[PDB]
Amino acid sequence: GFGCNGPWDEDDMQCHNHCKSIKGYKGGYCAKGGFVCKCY
């Protein structure tokens, strides 16, 4: 989710921007075949 909707729509930028607005995080990427937004 959060932009990471699998191979038909793997929107790393959307996930990154979700994550970046969470206190303590700086970015994010799609993981697990495109289906999971992982924040870091």
Author numbering: 1 to 40
What do the authors say?
Plectasin consists of 40 amino acids and shows well-defined secondary structural elements in form of an α-helix (M13-S21) and an antiparallel β-sheet (G28-A31; V36-C39). The structure of plectasin is stabilized by three disulfide bridges (C4-C30; C15-C37; C19-C39), which is typical for this type of defensins and leads to high conformational stability. Plectasin contains a cysteine-stabilised α-helix-β-sheet structure, which remains intact upon fibril formation. We have determined the structure, kinetics, and functionality associated with the pH-responsive self-assembly of the enhanced plectasin variant PPI42 into helical protein fibrils.
To elucidate the structural features that allow PPI42 to assemble into fibrils, while the plectasin wildtype did not fibrillate, we determined the crystal structure of the plectasin wildtype at a resolution of 1.1 Å. Our plectasin wildtype structure shows a high similarity to the published crystal structure (PDBID: 3E7U69) with only minor differences in the N-terminal loop (all-atom RMSD: 0.316 Å). When we compared our wildtype plectasin crystal structure to the fibril cryo-EM structure of PPI42, we observed a significant structural difference in the N-terminal loop region between amino acids 9 and 14. Two of these  positions are mutated in PPI42 (D9S; Q14K). We observed a network of polar interactions in the plectasin wildtype with (D9) forming a salt bridge to (N5). When mutated to (S9) in PPI42, the sidechain orientation changes and the sidechain forms a hydrogen bond to the (G6) backbone, which disrupts the network stabilizing this part of the N-terminal loop. In the plectasin wildtype, (H18) is coordinated in two different ways (50/50% distribution) stabilized by polar interaction with (Q14) and π-stacking with (F2), while in PPI42 only the π-stacking with (F2) occurs due to the mutation Q14K. Notably, the sidechains of (E10), (D11), and (D12) form intermolecular interfaces both in the protein crystal of the wildtype and in the fibril of PPI42. However, their orientation differs significantly between wildtype and PPI42. This structural difference may contribute to the different arrangement with the mutant forming the fibril and the wildtype forming the crystal.
